[PDB]
Amino acid sequence: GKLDLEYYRWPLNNVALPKLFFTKKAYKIYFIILVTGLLLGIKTFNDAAQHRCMALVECVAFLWASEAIPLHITAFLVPLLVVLFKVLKTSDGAIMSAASASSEILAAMWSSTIMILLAGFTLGEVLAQYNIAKVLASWLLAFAGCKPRNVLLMAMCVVFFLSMWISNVAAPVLTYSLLSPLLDAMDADSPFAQALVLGVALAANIGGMSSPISSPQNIISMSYLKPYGIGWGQFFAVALPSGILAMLLVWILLFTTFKMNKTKLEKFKPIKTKFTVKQYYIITVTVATILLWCVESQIEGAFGSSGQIAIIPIVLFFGTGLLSTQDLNAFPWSIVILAMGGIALGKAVSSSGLLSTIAKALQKKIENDGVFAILCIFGILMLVVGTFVSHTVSAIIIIPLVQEVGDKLGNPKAAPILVFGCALLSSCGMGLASSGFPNVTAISKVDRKGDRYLSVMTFLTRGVPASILAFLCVITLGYGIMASVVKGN
Amino acid sequence: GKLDLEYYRWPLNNVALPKLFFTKKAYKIYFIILVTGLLLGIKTFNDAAQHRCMALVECVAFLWASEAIPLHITAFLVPLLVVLFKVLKTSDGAIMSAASASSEILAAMWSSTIMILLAGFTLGEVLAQYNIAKVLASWLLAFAGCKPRNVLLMAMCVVFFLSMWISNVAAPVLTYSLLSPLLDAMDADSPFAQALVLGVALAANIGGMSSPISSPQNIISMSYLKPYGIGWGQFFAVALPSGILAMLLVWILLFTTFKMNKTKLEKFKPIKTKFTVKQYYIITVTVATILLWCVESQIEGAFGSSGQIAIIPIVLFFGTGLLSTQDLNAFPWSIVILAMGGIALGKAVSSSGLLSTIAKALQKKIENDGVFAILCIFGILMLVVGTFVSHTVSAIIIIPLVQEVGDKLGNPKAAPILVFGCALLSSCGMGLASSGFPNVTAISKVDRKGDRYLSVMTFLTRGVPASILAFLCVITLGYGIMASVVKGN
Ligand SMILES: CCCCCCCCCCCCCCCCCC(=O)OC[C@H](COP(=O)(O)O)OC(=O)CCCCCCCCCCCCCCCCC
Ligand SMILES: CCCCCCCCCCCCCCCCCC(=O)OC[C@H](COP(=O)(O)O)OC(=O)CCCCCCCCCCCCCCCCC
Ligand SMILES: CCCCCCCCCCCCCCCCCC(=O)OC[C@H](COP(=O)(O)O)OC(=O)CCCCCCCCCCCCCCCCC
Ligand SMILES: CCCCCCCCCCCCCCCCCC(=O)OC[C@H](COP(=O)(O)O)OC(=O)CCCCCCCCCCCCCCCCC
Ligand SMILES: CCCCCCCCCCCCCCCCCC(=O)OC[C@H](COP(=O)(O)O)OC(=O)CCCCCCCCCCCCCCCCC
Ligand SMILES: CCCCCCCCCCCCCCCCCC(=O)OC[C@H](COP(=O)(O)O)OC(=O)CCCCCCCCCCCCCCCCC
Numbered sequence: 010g011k012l013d014l015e016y017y018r019w020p021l022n023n024v025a026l027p028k029l030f031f032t033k034k035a036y037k038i039y040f041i042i043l044v045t046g047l048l049l050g051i052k053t054f055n056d057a058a059q060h061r062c063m064a065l066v067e068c069v070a071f072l073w074a075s076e077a078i079p080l081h082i083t084a085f086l087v088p089l090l091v092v093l094f095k096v097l098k099t100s101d102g103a104i105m106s107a108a109s110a111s112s113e114i115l116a117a118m119w120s121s122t123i124m125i126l127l128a129g130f131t132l133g134e135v136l137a138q139y140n141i142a143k144v145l146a147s148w149l150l151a152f153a154g155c156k157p158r159n160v161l162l163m164a165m166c167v168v169f170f171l172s173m174w175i176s177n178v179a180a181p182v183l184t185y186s187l188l189s190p191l192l193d194a195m196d197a198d199s200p201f202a203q204a205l206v207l208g209v210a211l212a213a214n215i216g217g218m219s220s221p222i223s224s225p226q227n228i229i230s231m232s233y234l235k236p237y238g239i240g241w242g243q244f245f246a247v248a249l250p251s252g253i254l255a256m257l258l259v260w261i262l263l264f265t266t267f268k269m270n271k272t273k274l275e276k277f278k279p280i281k282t283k284f285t286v287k288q289y290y291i292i293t294v295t296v297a298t299i300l301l302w303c304v305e306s307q308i309e310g311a312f313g314s315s316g317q318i319a320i321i322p323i324v325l326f327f328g329t330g331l332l333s334t335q336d337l338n339a340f341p342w343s344i345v346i347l348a349m350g351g352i353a354l355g356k357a358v359s360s361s362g363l364l365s366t367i368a369k370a371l372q373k374k375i376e377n378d379g380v381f382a383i384l385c386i387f388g389i390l391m392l393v394v395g396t397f398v399s400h401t402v403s404a405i406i407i408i409p410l411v412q413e414v415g416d417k418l419g420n421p422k423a424a425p426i427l428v429f430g431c432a433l434l435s436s437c438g439m440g441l442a443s444s445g446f447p448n449v450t451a452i453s454k455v456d457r458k459g460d461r462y463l464s465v466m467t468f469l470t471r472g473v474p475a476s477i478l479a480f481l482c483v484i485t486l487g488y489g490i491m492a493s494v495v496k497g498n
Numbered sequence: 499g500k501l502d503l504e505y506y507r508w509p510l511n512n513v514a515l516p517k518l519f520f521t522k523k524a525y526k527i528y529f530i531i532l533v534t535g536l537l538l539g540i541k542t543f544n545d546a547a548q549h550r551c552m553a554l555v556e557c558v559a560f561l562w563a564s565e566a567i568p569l570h571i572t573a574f575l576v577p578l579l580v581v582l583f584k585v586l587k588t589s590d591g592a593i594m595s596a597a598s599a600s601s602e603i604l605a606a607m608w609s610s611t612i613m614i615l616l617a618g619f620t621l622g623e624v625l626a627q628y629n630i631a632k633v634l635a636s637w638l639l640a641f642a643g644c645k646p647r648n649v650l651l652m653a654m655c656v657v658f659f660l661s662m663w664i665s666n667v668a669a670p671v672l673t674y675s676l677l678s679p680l681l682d683a684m685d686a687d688s689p690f691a692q693a694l695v696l697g698v699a700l701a702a703n704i705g706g707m708s709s710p711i712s713s714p715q716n717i718i719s720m721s722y723l724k725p726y727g728i729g730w731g732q733f734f735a736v737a738l739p740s741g742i743l744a745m746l747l748v749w750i751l752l753f754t755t756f757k758m759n760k761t762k763l764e765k766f767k768p769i770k771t772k773f774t775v776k777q778y779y780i781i782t783v784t785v786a787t788i789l790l791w792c793v794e795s796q797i798e799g800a801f802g803s804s805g806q807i808a809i810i811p812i813v814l815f816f817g818t819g820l821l822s823t824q825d826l827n828a829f830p831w832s833i834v835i836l837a838m839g840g841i842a843l844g845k846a847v848s849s850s851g852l853l854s855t856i857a858k859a860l861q862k863k864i865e866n867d868g869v870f871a872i873l874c875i876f877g878i879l880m881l882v883v884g885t886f887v888s889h890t891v892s893a894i895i896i897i898p899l900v901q902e903v904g905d906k907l908g909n910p911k912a913a914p915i916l917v918f919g920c921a922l923l924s925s926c927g928m929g930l931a932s933s934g935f936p937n938v939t940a941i942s943k944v945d946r947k948g949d950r951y952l953s954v955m956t957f958l959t960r961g962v963p964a965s966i967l968a969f970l971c972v973i974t975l976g977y978g979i980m981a982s983v984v985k986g987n
């Protein structure tokens with residue numbers, strides 16, 4: 010790059026200061042340090058680790074929300090700040106040493122969801138490179154029709170259906186690969202392109218709560234709901250209508266706030282050419298990988314996790330030479346780092362006990378407020394916490410808490426409804442583009458010239474209203490179905 | 499890519515089989531499967547995990563040595579095989595379940611050395627992009643002169659000196675960045691380029707044992723040697739001459755086996771242009787990072803590990819915009835995956851107890867043989883093991899064993915000599931291009947056109963003799979120096 014800097018010089022011999030210290034970016038960093046120092050000097054929490062974790066959370070949230078530095082660079086900063094702020098605790102409850110904290114926070118960044126994301130890139134690239142996504146898109150785009158909002162609805166439906174069965178870690182990447190014949194011809198400035206990328210992410214967020222296996226929090230809650238009598242049929246009777254209504258409401262939000270209705274789309278007459286033998290190999294591996302992800306619980310005794318299943322497509326496509334080393338190097342690795350930062354942030358929150366202390370204090374003031382009151386107040390907590398903190402982390406703490414509140418209530422249906430309701434509401438917080446796999450994928454997508462489709466502000470002005478719509482769909486339709494579907498015994 | 503395959507058709511209606519099943523790669527894969535199945539079906543080790551771990555180690559070593567599939571793809575395969583082969587054990591000693599094994603194996607991939615490697619990439623890119631590596635190389639190349647073997651010696655000395663203080667994780671990357679003004683003009687087919695790339699890796703391997711802080715095994719051995727009276731002066735009196743002699747012998751090996759002596763090099767007159775303010779910022783950050791890596795032990799109470807220090811240059815160069823998102827995406831991520839696979843293989847080896855059992859069996863048969871005999875036999879063991887397994891893991895298992903053997907011996911100098919020699923000899927195994935950070939970096943290097951400088955066979959034909967040379971240099975010169983320097987009390 011360039012070796013020179015511009016300065017502000019005031020002759021008074023003269024004090025010349027670089028202009029990089031007087032920009033909007035510098036002002037955000039100045040303000041962030043000011044708040045973090047104030048939070049680190051004013052007694053917030055009685056527990057020192059939780060007190061410093063509150064400052065750590067704000068600093069990371071402020072950096073991500075304002076994008077003073079790149080989002081994935083803030084993700085790199087998270088492990089450094091976790092060790093520096095001394096927030097990690099042992100199982101005994103003492104502050105972990107910096108050496109122990111360094112290894113603990115670094116070990117948590119690589120996980121099964123990272124492997125699923127890499128398999129998502131592998132599947133998406135191999136499907137686009139051998140003209141399978143092009144043929145598949147020619148049929149979906151023919152079904153949707155010429156209207157841009159119908160194409161938007163189709164894209165949100167595909168990712169919603171995918172996240173129902175294989176979760177929303179890889180579903181957005183597969184959906185974007187399916188949409189590649191249409192997205193690659195449009196620029197990042199296009200309102201229709203912006204709605205499509207944002208719509209897939211928001212629908213994937215909603216798709217994550219619609220099935221008993223659609224998200225890690227859904228699986229955990231299903232373990233809590235089984236003793237009460239809730240099964241797959243009961244779960245689908247509540248979650249699926251709630252998520253479909255939320256997706257439809259978010260869909261209306263997209264095509265009414267984006268100027269994406271006068272765009273003229275190309276007619277996609279379906280491609281009716283027979284697949285080759287090599288293409289059948291890709292399809293078989295792609296379908297088998299998806300099916301194995303669906304039955305992950307039934308094959309966990311041999312594979313352990315979906316991240317181990319994710320390895321099979323990677324070896325079968327890179328090891329046979331279908332994808333080259335350049336293809337692996339061309340993966341979007343900033344997405345991987347940004348995801349690891351969120352996982353590291355969640356570990357710090359859970360290890361310090363910050364969220365547990367916050368939720369426990371809320372439990373004491375609403376323990377005798379009624380089932381609907383607890384669901385709205387605790388659901389608001391997950392909506393705010395889930396916006397900044399991982400949905401899996403928050404659900405692990407909150408769900409056992411609302412279970413003991415529900416048990417104390419004299420209503421035998423209180424505990425199943427609280428566990429069910431909070432499980433769905435654990436996925437509603439989606440206003441921050443740097444939290445959650447669908448949001449990270451969407452806020453990293455670029456067009457042909459490398460320009461970003463979405464900004465953090467665009468994700469905030471639509472994700473926050475979308476989070477509210479999803480919240481209202483759960484506590485109005487979902488709660489109404491729960492009162493009839495869920496029995497107490 | 500292409501959609502069609504070529505077939506072998508024998509009319510007999512006709513049985514047409516694709517030609518991909520009758521290639522050298524297919525034959526290698528068939529042989530590897532055959533050997534792995536034979537090992538899994540014939541009773542090797544009494545412990546079930548260690549028997550299957552032996553099969554896993556053989557399979558992975560064969561895949562890497564034959565390069566039937568890409569090395570980083572084998573690295574990706576390593577965690578899947580670790581879970582499938584059921585080799586990981588609990589601290590109790592029972593076989594870990596597939597889910598817990600998946601989580602444990604995935605947690606081990608991301609570590610401090612990965613962060614150090616990423617910081618090495620960041621520093622190398624920022625130094626080359628802002629014309630600091632060019633100026634620095636204009637002086638080193640001027641000192642070396644026109645003779646190619648002198649340039650080779652200069653590069654090996656530079657990487658050796660760097661690995662002495664900051665270890666050989668980032669030192670090879672920095673050395674290659676310093677050599678970019680000369681390496682970028684030469685093709686992968688050039689014998690001189692191959693010699694330079696291989697020599698940097700081999701001298702980094704040798705430099706990893708030359709200092710008390712040059713490698714993790716060196717630090718562990720220094721912890722084991724302090725009670726005996728060995729300090730920095732005693733360590734340097736033995737390790738540094740041995741490492742220098744080994745490096746000189748490997749250098750002679752390189753310039754006599756490679757036809758790299760008739761190549762004509764451009765004269766590098768030193769660049770004498772003053773640095774800019776921005777360049778001074780880069781130099782200051784780089785020097786501060788190197789110094790903090792050097793004093794890692796003195797600042798562990800705050801930073802915990804060199805991986806956390808590695809974050810500081812990454813943030814300071816990416817969040818200030820000196821390096822872009824494309825620069826991060828242009829990192830050689832295949833190197834990272836290969837290193838992660840090596841770490842996972844080491845974790846599988848240590849968890850099963852295979853290496854511990856092998857070393858204990860050797861100890862039970864060489865417990866009374868004399869100090870030199872025990873040193874030579876355990877050094878051969880460490881050479882073979884570290885050719886395939888991580889040097890850190892093998893040192894961790896072996897050093898306490900040789901310490902207990904030396905304690906049993908009536909010679910009061912036996913224990914310090916055994917620990918010291920085994921510490922030096924734990925780094926000699928360098929014949930496999932897929933094991934160790936310098937070897938992985940060298941085997942992943944490509945020229946402008948993307949062609950690889952080195953092959954696995956080229957690494958084997960020179961790496962094994964280099965390992966033998968290092969072993970002999972230790973067990974003769976280092977042993978002679980130990981016999982006088984090391985006192986017993
Ligand atoms: C963009 C980066 C923003 C980073 C923001 C960091 C926050 C700075 C807050 C200012 C310091 C205020 C101290 C007030 C008293 C603290 C007492 C307390 O409770 O804490 C003690 C606490 C633990 O001490 P204990 O009480 O003994 O446990 O220590 C700290 O909190 C240490 C302070 C953290 C230092 C942060 C360093 C940031 C590294 C940046 C890496 C380089 C890249 C630069 C970014 C590039 C952007 C262009
Ligand atoms: C100017 C300085 C403030 C600037 C803004 C700071 C942002 C973070 C606010 C933190 C304020 C301190 C919270 C705790 C104070 C009382 C603690 C206590 O004694 O416990 C009471 C109580 C219960 O704890 P217990 O009483 O100790 O059991 O805890 C709380 O009330 C905690 C409330 C936390 C609310 C802040 C959550 C924000 C998370 C995201 C970070 C900010 C993102 C904003 C950017 C978004 C852009 C769209
Ligand atoms: C193309 C060439 C083949 C590609 C193969 C891909 C990867 C190899 C998968 C081989 C499966 C071997 C694991 C099972 C070993 C016996 C079970 C065991 O040890 O666990 C006991 C374990 C019990 O553990 P517990 O539940 O904790 O007691 O058994 C089970 O309950 C799990 C049974 C899982 C069975 C999965 C069947 C295989 C599905 C398909 C595999 C991948 C297909 C390839 C996809 C692309 C097609 C072109
Ligand atoms: C003696 C005991 C061993 C024998 C028993 C059978 C061995 C088990 C199956 C091994 C697979 C046989 C061929 C292996 C090498 C294939 C060639 C290649 O990678 O490049 C093809 C080829 C490139 O190589 P080229 O054609 O030679 O340039 O790439 C393709 O075109 C791939 C797409 C064509 C259709 C799929 C190819 C078959 C994939 C089989 C996947 C199984 C791999 C290993 C399974 C491990 C678990 C057992
Ligand atoms: C290139 C890939 C090479 C992979 C090499 C895999 C080795 C295959 C050996 C053949 C099976 C022999 C079984 C003999 C009896 C085993 C008994 C025993 O001790 O073990 C039981 C042991 C545990 O059972 P337990 O005794 O109940 O604990 O189970 C196994 O060892 C399961 C067998 C492992 C299956 C390997 C699957 C390979 C995954 C490939 C992924 C797809 C990508 C393909 C590569 C692309 C290349 C182009
Ligand atoms: C044709 C089939 C073999 C093909 C080649 C297989 C390669 C690996 C050889 C493993 C053979 C089995 C070893 C253990 C057999 C006896 C076990 C026993 O009862 O314990 C005795 C004894 C002590 O155990 P204990 O008596 O149970 O306490 O263990 C051994 O002697 C272990 C010896 C291990 C030797 C293999 C080391 C190779 C590591 C790298 C993998 C292969 C690399 C080659 C490719 C590179 C080419 C440049």
Ligand SMILES: CCCCCCCCCCCCCCCCCC(=O)OC[C@H](COP(=O)(O)O)OC(=O)CCCCCCCCCCCCCCCCC
Nearest residue numbers: 093106107782783786787790796797798799800801810814
């Ligand atoms: C450019 C803007 C500044 C960039 C700075 C980036 C990194 C900021 C880190 C600042 C230091 C914060 C940690 C110290 C907090 C107090 C000590 C503590 O809590 O641990 C107790 C801890 C005791 O733990 P124990 O040993 O387990 O008892 O103290 C120590 O023994 C460790 C002492 C650490 C001293 C570190 C000195 C800092 C050197 C400079 C670091 C930044 C270099 C910047 C490179 C680029 C320059 C342009």
Ligand SMILES: CCCCCCCCCCCCCCCCCC(=O)OC[C@H](COP(=O)(O)O)OC(=O)CCCCCCCCCCCCCCCCC
Nearest residue numbers: 028029030032034035038039042043776779817818819820
């Ligand atoms: C109210 C309390 C807070 C105030 C107290 C002081 C704050 C601590 C120091 C914060 C650094 C001040 C400027 C921050 C943003 C710099 C602009 C930028 O990144 O782009 C420059 C600039 C690009 O921005 P542009 O010039 O506006 O396009 O990039 C460069 O040219 C960088 C090379 C020039 C020389 C180095 C720049 C100074 C780096 C300072 C590193 C410290 C960062 C934060 C430290 C965290 C721990 C405290």
